């Protein structure tokens, strides 16, 4: 319904938050690893019944009190470890999400030639198995010239995590540029292009992907359901992690950003608009990738389910493959990788704006604010240093370990702990009134049943059956060794143990010197809790 060109700019500014590398890069690869038919039902169930409720909760919780992901734990000071856990998640994201941007900068710079290198098998990195889309009987185990460019030129992939080999100086140069553009923007800190350029660019590659032979096999493998893979806890863990991750849940940036939002803003409306358009965008970005896998399937002579069973890298095997079938091919490659760059840098900007803000709110005001630039610089320096091994010859083995464990189901359990802490310790009764003070209407009954019963029930059983059914992680038939999966668990629970660790620390610091009344003193709200100066029904 028409609104004099004003509200449509609020829609397009919202749309620009929904599209990101969390769905242009991350959704298709998980969707393939789980096998599309199996992933789509769990993804929708977890997004409807858990993700959207926890997204709206994190927005409201921050907007109401108007405090960052740490200082909002003034409802129950004992649980401030949930906020520190969200900073451990945010610091695992920042280091690896810049090497996803290295690869984007490398393919963007690499597109500055007369011929795209990944188009043919006539290059020195290529094996005898290279099939060639444009290029006797040769091979039993054929490969795409784009799989070999990725695996043997971009990243000279070692056979193991232990073989760090040598650092990829071109990718490390891109890590430098990536961290500079980020840091420089945090000093400088038009909508239409940011919010639409991804969609017109995805539509070009989609209309291309649809017209290729065998695309329907890829689309069919994407959409026909697998009601046979349904009891695998890993599918529900991955689907839950993607439903929470792609919305920004348990990165803590949501709360911190919402703290700047107007007290009477409609965070219900903004949660539906962002999450519904994010859902659709993910399904679209996945559709185009699968329409390309359908083409690689008959081009290589194998079942769609085993064409390119990667992790990170699917978007750097598949989108490159499709670009070589477009006319004026390098122009669209430059525009495509520039779209990925400006999608990625936009989330690093919001992540690092958050991370610095929360670290400042935690400390004595004047000197830490004089240090604002120096601390942002310290984060970008430390983010480059911790990124070096991901540019090593073993890099993506660690990239999949951080993304599949440190930044996966940990987001779901950290936000489940918040869900129960607010609903049962603070009290749903008290919280729904707090929402009603700023929206004017109570939460829809759907969110009331979801927060109180569904979300802890679903999350609890996915947690239990994942522990029962766990299998060693594999990147495309490289099976990870015993020490590596042990580091995976340590990164995964490094952010969760922050909760009980702070609980021990407060139960030591707090007054009481008795068994349980000190836990009651530690769980009830702070005297400073609630909104700023004027906005009090109780105060």
């Amino acid at each position, epitope marked *: 319904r028409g609104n004099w060109g004003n509200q449509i700019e609020f829609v397009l500014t919202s749309v620009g938050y929904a599209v990101g590398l969390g769905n242009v890069w991350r959704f298709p690869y998980l969707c393939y690893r789980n096998g599309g038919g199996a992933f789509m039902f769990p993804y929708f169930i977890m997004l409807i019944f858990c993700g959207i409720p926890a997204f709206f909760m994190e927005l409201s919780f921050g907007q109401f009190a108007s405090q960052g992901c740490l200082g909002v734990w003034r409802i129950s000071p004992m649980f401030k470890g949930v906020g520190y856990g969200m900073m451990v998640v945010s610091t695992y994201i920042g280091i690896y999400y810049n090497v996803v941007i290295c690869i984007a900068f490398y393919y963007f710079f690499s597109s500055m030639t007369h011929v*795209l290198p990944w*188009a043919y098998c006539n290059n020195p990195w290529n094996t005898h198995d290279c099939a060639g*889309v444009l*290029d006797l009987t040769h091979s039993l185990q054929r490969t795409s010239p784009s799989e070999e460019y990725w695996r043997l030129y971009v990243l000279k992939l070692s056979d193991d995590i232990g073989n760090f080999g040598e650092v990829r100086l071109p990718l490390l140069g891109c890590l430098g540029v990536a961290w500079l553009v980020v840091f420089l923007c945090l000093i400088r800190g038009v909508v239409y292009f940011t919010a639409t350029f991804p969609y017109v660019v995805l539509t070009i590659l989609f209309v291309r992907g*649809v017209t290729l*032979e065998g695309a329907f096999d890829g689309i069919m493998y994407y959409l026909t359901p697998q009601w046979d893979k349904i009891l695998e806890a890993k599918v529900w863990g991955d689907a839950a992690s993607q439903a929470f991750y792609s919305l920004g849940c348990a990165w803590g940036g949501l709360i911190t950003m919402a703290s700047y939002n107007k007290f009477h803003n409609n965070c219900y409306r903004d949660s539906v608009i962002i999450s519904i358009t994010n859902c659709a965008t993910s399904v679209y970005a996945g559709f185009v990738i699968f329409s390309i896998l359908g083409f690689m399937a008959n*081009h290589l002579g194998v079942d769609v389910s085993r064409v390119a069973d990667h992790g990170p890298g699917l978007a750097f095997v598949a989108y490159p493959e499709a670009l070589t*079938l*477009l006319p004026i091919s*390098p122009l669209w490659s430059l525009l495509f990788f520039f779209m990925l760059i400006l999608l990625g840098l936009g989330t690093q900007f919001c992540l690092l704006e958050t991370l610095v803000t929360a670290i400042v709110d935690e400390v004595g005001n004047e000197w830490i604010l004089q240090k604002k630039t120096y601390v942002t610089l310290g984060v970008a320096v430390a983010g480059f240093l911790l990124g070096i091994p991901l540019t090593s010859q073993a890099g993506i083995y660690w990239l999949l370990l951080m993304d599949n464990y440190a930044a996966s189901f940990s987001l779901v359990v950290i936000s489940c702990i918040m869900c129960v802490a607010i609903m049962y310790i603070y009290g749903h009764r008290n919280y729904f009134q707090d929402i009603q003070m700023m929206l004017g209407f109570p939460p829809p009954l759907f969110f009331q049943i979801c927060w109180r019963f569904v979300s802890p029930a679903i999350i609890f059983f996915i947690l239990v059956f994942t522990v029962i059914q766990y299998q060693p992680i594999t990147y495309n038939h490289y099976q990870y060794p015993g020490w590596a999966v042990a580091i995976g668990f340590l990164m995964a629970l490094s952010s969760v143990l922050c909760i009980p660790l702070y609980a021990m620390f407060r139960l030591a610091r707090t007054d009481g010197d008795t068994l349980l009344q000190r836990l009651k003193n530690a769980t009830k709200p702070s005297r400073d809790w609630g909104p700023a100066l004027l906005e009090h029904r109780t105060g």
Partner: nanobody
Amino acid sequence: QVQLVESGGGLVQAGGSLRLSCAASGFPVYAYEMYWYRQAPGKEREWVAAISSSGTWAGYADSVKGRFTISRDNAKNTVYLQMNSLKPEDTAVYYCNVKDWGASWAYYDYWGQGTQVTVS
């Protein structure tokens, strides 16, 4: 390496039908859009039709729409132009074409031998 060889031309009366075949070899033709053109006597080489890699989208010249049907059989490495409701102005040398962009800023048009159609 790339070769294109058309067949199916000749004399036909107005209101008649012909099916031109183009046999393609020397490349993975399933990856390419295929095109048809015609060169009428005393006239410049004109576009007639195009077909997607899978045959999902098929496009035609405004003076041909609804009269000719383009189709392909990627197992045989062929593209066909089914010509119906032929009229004298359809008299031309019909050429089969593929444009290899080579993952570059330009294309090499590869041309078939040309097959004459003559409509009385």
